[PDB]
Design brief:
3 domains, hexosyltransferase activity (chains A, B), 6-hairpin_glycosidase_sf (chains A, B), 41 strands, carbohydrate binding (chains A, B), homodimer, 25% strand, alpha+beta, binds D-gluconic acid, glycosyltransferase (chains A, B), binds D-glucono-1,5-lactone, 11-stranded antiparallel sheet, binds chloride ion, 6hp_glycosidase-like_sf (chains A, B)
């Protein structure tokens, strides 16, 4: 079974084998943890760069998670063994490592915690994980209950494997003074500069108990012996051996021996995490490790998640959509803007898009993000590939490879901010540049961004692609300095059209004329060189070849040029239906729209690394949700309401059981992709990446608020412009906007020709609610033809 | 049980649980594989840089092996499941992954192959691995025999897990045309330059069958299902499902179904390895995958190992020493010089020391190695930190961190070469430098090396240490440009004394006077600033502090300054007994002599990274065998025969059972270390690193040939100068030298005062055999007081 519980606070899965990859996540200001239904987990924390405290059993590469992450028996996780001392029989919660037959199993994804209920051998177990807001520590609560009529003698053993911490130095032992196990390493390095760099690293891992245990074991190999994780030797004997680890792989295992009466339940608390030293661990113990510590953390964490609850609650005829939108969507948006994916150098397009989502959650965060981002703009007007969030941080990984699209996001996302808040006054704020002494207004920075995009174009009027644009691994189209991007061109025209509107709203008319004419010029160049007859091509290589065309067998059509040609005006009314039909014929699937098709099956070295990913995975033809939502936003922009909704709704798994089993994910987030290459590899199509980091969600939330429900801000107030799917005879939404609340009721009427809007029961003229008082609630009735 | 078999060709272990870390190795011109007794293996190959074909189940760091490598259930390995189709019962060879009760178990380390015999359920299994000389491929031979009286119906399943190959792209399927499983990936990267760099990578892994199987499975998860490795789901059912891997972790599993008659045995062959493409895999199949292919490979491989058999066969009263020396030592030496540890940039001291060992195996390799190394000498005279073996290779890892000792090895190791071969004419060969146009003789290059060492010294006359000397991680003594090394000083005096002797032998008398006076000057500076009263200190920091002294609590005495002070003459006859007693009191252990003591337990940042390794591991106070053998060589140099032998013999585990169990290794190699910190952590002391890469063995072989057996070359012929331990009443050695053979018999006589030597039964005067004819055999009798 799989369903929402607890009035939407949690989502419960009742089989540990039907959806074995399914997972949920938690975060806080400094860490995140992905937890698998069976007990495996991946946890990363910032200090201020990424690090971990629970390691693989080998030397792992520097990495958080892969799409479609595989697990394996020794993968890090969070486990408890229960042993009936009368019979010798054992089981483990949550399910791994023993995989015993259970009488009951529930995995509860929560907004603020992750929990399990399980039962075996007549013993009922509850396990609950949560995080505090501000510190790096896992709070664990274990309940064990004798559900039968006679007393039962049990051994209970937390098993929190620490793994292979370091080839240079790793160890562990029991600390009575800290009250638990302390594992210790030195992070490996060879350069003397790294010694100075690494000085404040939290290289100890603690596992601390509230309740003193009977015994402990810190040596992984001694724990398992010949029995392995299935039947550890240390658990077969009466008492743990109390061994340490001396340049041996450490582990955190405790043992409690209890005789429980009929119906008796006992509670045990633990904290697990990194520390610089034992004094930091004790500080966390004092702060957290108690009933009062746990309550106080949970109450503060609940407040934090509520502060990000967003601005739209819906009640539609689709209860799966209601649950997702009301409970899970705004939390996933909030994660992105509040902690920026836990990188010190967010990719610029990510930083701007994720903060765009915050417009609908905590717009002051958005405001500050524009100011921060623009302070790092180059004197030329160009934006850097990443935004540094800390003094001393550096550009890393893809951020070191020159991409060209970073400026385009500024007006695209600023538009959402200005529509929602009406904070035009942000345009007047003064910000420096990355170098030099110039300090200029936001508005002047934006002008320079748009002049950059106009100047970064070849003699045909098309934008240079260098080693990529929005498609990160599209790196061989323009690496020799001549290749251009189809997508970046049509997006630049959108960006310039939007910014020109803003300039007109601010009386900057020379700017409005310049950027409008730039957009026309680009669109004309697109129509002359990129349009391929039935859709727009993707780019032109360094050697003058147009790809993403009907003459290409693989990569015959890309989604993005089509969406953005719609948005930016390259696609006129005659071209639009060609676009729609080509997308439906070649890209639409039951799991959503693919970003390209057919997927590449071998390297094409005038396009690049994208073509080397497995066909159907990530940018190589997956249902890449962020590309799909740009298409949805484009469809909304031309009133293609039914097509927009159908494709948006495909992004949410369920309720169809085969769909749920095939995607393999809980419906508590949208992943960065569902596997594509639907025609070429149908067996795997739809499978979830399980990756909760995606810029998709800020756009999905925008599309629902402004597009589908049609409750959009303007300089006059709230514009009512719904595009509800025609199947809904009635719907409701509650919209928080500019400090007020709107209780909106939508209803289809036989007796009207045009939409009718009533405010507090009287008919308005026009479609804008203009008198909005902070703290007030308004009743809106929207009758639709 | 644990003993030599097959007239010394193999070494057999008969328990899979008593020594669970024990392993042996195989290599060839392009690869090496470490195989664990239980079936785990680590394999690396050169293409021309290091790579692998069997991967961990996660994203692993770029690495071969760690000291004291831990295993875990999903670690790469080489397995076969056997299923009784009548009962459902299963077991696996060699032992993992099922860990069933066996009726018989043997693990056979071989000079040329690795094999197992096991029995369970009345079925007898043999498994044999070998490599060819020149290609990268594992040759596997499986025999299955019904040992009972009735027919038996079995399923037999090779399980060669491929692991997680790549986040970008991984897959696998069955290829009828190749005749087996082909797994395929693209090695991940992001920089366009890496695409061009990676073009010839062997990114497919094959598992090819000689005999067509009933079924196959290429999806790891489908193979295991809920049963895991213990009881795979795919093996529970009647037939494998024949599934593929599509951006899923691949595996190589086949299924054979057989009814075997009473006493019937069947043989099955497979090859496993990397390939660029299916055409390369088929090429390997045609070449190797047959009875004739396997025989031809084995016969050619046996010839290759015999070509490296070395120059000394012994028959002493210690049969453990005989076995090691005769069978295992020369093979380990040969590996080092023949393939240079499978790095394209050997550390200079390693390249020179390993090739020194080749003096006794294939001296023309040594000769060529001096010429190659010197061609990369800098115009200053300094030697680079590594030696590049291929055009386009680069310095990597420690080779990028400035160390200062590289020149000292040249005369130290050249001496062994000249004594063994008498090839003084090498000195006249002309070689360029790393830059510039100068081409000069070997002899002139050497002069410039020794002038470098003289000039790289501070105002006190002591050698600069920069970021390390022989002790690789000793990086904070001199990183600010002032710190000096105690060891490098006393070694430089040795090197200069040796080279001066050579110059005198060549009539270069001005050179001999200059280098001799340099040595005296250094030794005087050592005695004034480094001698600490009872032993020599290790160095002086950038801020003027002498460490490795009686005032230091940790790192109170280092071994190396003492050995090399003996060799280079800083230690006079009054100091020597202080050295010996300090080493015995503070450094000697039952497992050998520690390199420093007590081990460091925390960072000391004017000494550096060495102090951060776990106490007892590697350079932080282990029995670091290469330091120990320098001390043994120093003891031989002053006729401390009993102490030299006792410490050399401690490097070989066994026959004491507690010793064997505690070190945890087969006696078929010397590891780079046995765990130290004997006083501080006695539980783990003696544990083998299991690392067969070590410069120890060229020195151990030298010490035995020239020192203990005392059969040493000179410009006059063979000098007879044995230092046998006094317990041996008789011994024999057969020595190959300058193309002749010497059958030497040693015997203790009551009736003489001085050694007496007879050649072909007549007494000689003096101790040199001077008339040596190539192809002749000489009988030598050495009577000793
Ligand atoms: O192929 C790649 O280079 C990676 O997929 C990137 O596109 C990353 O996913 C991105 O930097 C977010 O981490
Ligand atoms: O601590 C370290 O830097 C490593 O131990 C080195 O000393 C390597 O072992 C050496 O480069 C051989 O690989
Ligand atoms: O993973 C990603 O993929 C996207 C497609 O390459 C890119 O636009 C985002 O900035 C990046 O986070
Ligand atoms: O691992 C090593 O350790 C030694 C000690 O640091 C060093 O001298 C060798 O060159 C190096 O191979
Ligand atoms: Cl794209
Ligand atoms: Cl040393």
């Amino acid at each position: 079974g799989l369903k929402a519980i607890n009035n939407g606070e949690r989502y419960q899965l009742t089989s540990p084998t039907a959806m074995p990859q399914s997972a949920s996540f938690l975060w806080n200001k400094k860490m995140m943890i992905q937890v698998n239904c069976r007990g495996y987990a991946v946890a990363q924390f910032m200090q201020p760069e990424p690090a971990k405290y629970a390691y693989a059993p080998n030397l792992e590469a520097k990495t958080f998670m892969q799409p479609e992450q595989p697990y394996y028996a020794h993968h890090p996780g969070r486990f408890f063994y229960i042993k009936d001392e009368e019979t010798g029989e054992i089981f483990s919660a949550p399910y791994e490592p023993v995989r015993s037959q259970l009488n009951n199993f529930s995995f509860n994804a929560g907004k603020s915690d992750i929990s399990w209920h399980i039962a075996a051998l007549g013993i009922e177990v509850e396990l609950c994980l949560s995080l505090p807001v501000d510190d790096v520590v896992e709070l664990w609560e274990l309940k064990i209950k004798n559900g039968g009529a006679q007393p039962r003698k049990l051994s209970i053993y937390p098993y929190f494997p620490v793994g292979y911490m370091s080839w240079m130095n790793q160890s562990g032992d029991y600390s009575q003074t800290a009250g638990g196990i302390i594992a210790s390493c030195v992070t490996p390095y060879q350069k003397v500069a790294d010694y100075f760099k690494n000085k404040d690293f939290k290289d100890k891992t603690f596992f601390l108990h509230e309740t003193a245990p009977a015994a402990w074991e810190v040596n992984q190999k001694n724990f398992e012996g010949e029995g392995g994780l299935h039947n550890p030797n240390a658990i077969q004997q009466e008492t743990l051996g109390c061994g340490n680890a001396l340049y041996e792989t450490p582990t955190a295992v405790l043992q409690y021996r209890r005789e429980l009466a009929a119906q008796e339940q006992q509670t045990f608390r633990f904290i697990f995490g990194p520390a610089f030293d034992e004094s930091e661990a004790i500080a966390l113990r004092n702060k957290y490790l108690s009933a009062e510590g746990f309550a106080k953390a949970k109450s503060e964490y609940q407040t934090y998640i509520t502060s990000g609850k967003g601005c739209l609650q819906i009640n539609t005829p689709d209860p799966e959509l209601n649950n997702f939108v009301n409970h899970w969507l705004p939390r996933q948006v909030f994660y992105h803007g509040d902690v920026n994916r836990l990188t010190t150098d967010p990719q610029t397009r990510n930083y701007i898009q994720d903060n765009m989502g915050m417009s609908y959650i905590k717009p002051n965060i958005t405001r500050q993000a524009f100011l921060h981002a623009l302070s790092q703009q180059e004197e030329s007007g160009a934006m850097p590939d990443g935004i540094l969030l800390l003094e001393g941080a550096e550009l890393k990984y893809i951020n070191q490879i020159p991409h060209t699209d970073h400026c385009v996001w500024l007006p695209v996302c600023m538009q959402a901010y200005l529509d929602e808040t009406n904070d035009y006054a942000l345009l007047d704020e003064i910000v420096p540049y990355a170098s030099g002494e110039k300090r200029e207004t936001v508005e002047q920075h934006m002008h320079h961004a748009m002049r950059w995009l106009l100047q970064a174009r070849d003699e045909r009027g098309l934008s240079f692609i260098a080693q990529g644009d929005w498609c990160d691994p599209m790196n061989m189209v323009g690496y020799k300095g001549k290749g251009v991007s189809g997508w970046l061109s049509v997006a630049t025209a959108y960006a310039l059209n939007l910014w020109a509107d803003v300039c007109e709203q601010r009386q900057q008319n020379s700017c409005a004329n310049e950027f409008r004419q730039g957009a026309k010029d680009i669109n004309a160049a697109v129509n002359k060189h990129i349009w391929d007859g039935e859709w727009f091509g993707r780019g032109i290589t360094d050697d003058g070849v147009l790809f993403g065309t009907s003459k290409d067998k693989e990569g015959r059509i890309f989604l993005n040029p089509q969406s953005w040609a719609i948005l930016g005006g390259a696609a006129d009314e005659q071209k639009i239906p060609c676009l729609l039909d080509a997308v439906e014929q070649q890209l639409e699937t039951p799991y959503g729209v693919m970003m390209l098709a057919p997927a590449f099956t071998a390297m094409r070295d005038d396009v690049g690394r994208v073509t080397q990913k497995f066909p159907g995975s990530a940018e190589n033809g997956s249902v890449y949700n962020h590309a799909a939502v740009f298409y949805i936003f484009s469809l909304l922009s031309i009133g293609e309401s039914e097509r927009a909704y159908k494709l948006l709704r495909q992004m949410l798994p369920g309720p169809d059981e085969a769909d749920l089993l095939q995607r393999g994910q809980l419906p508590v987030f949208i992943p960065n992709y569902y596997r594509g290459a639907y025609y070429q590899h149908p067996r795997t199509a739809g499978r979830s990446s399980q990756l909760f980091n995606t810029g998709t969600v800020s756009w999905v939330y925008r599309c629902l608020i402004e597009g589908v429900f049609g409750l959009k801000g303007s300089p006059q107030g709230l514009v009512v412009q719904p595009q509800l799917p025609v199947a809904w005879q009635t719907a409701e939404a509650v919209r928080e906007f500019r400090g007020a609340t709107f209780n909106v009721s939508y209803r289809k009427s036989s007796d009207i020709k045009e939409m009718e809007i009533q405010l507090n029961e009287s008919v308005i003229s026009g479609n804008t609610i203009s008198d909005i008082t902070a703290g007030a609630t308004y009743q809106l009735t929207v009758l639709l033809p």
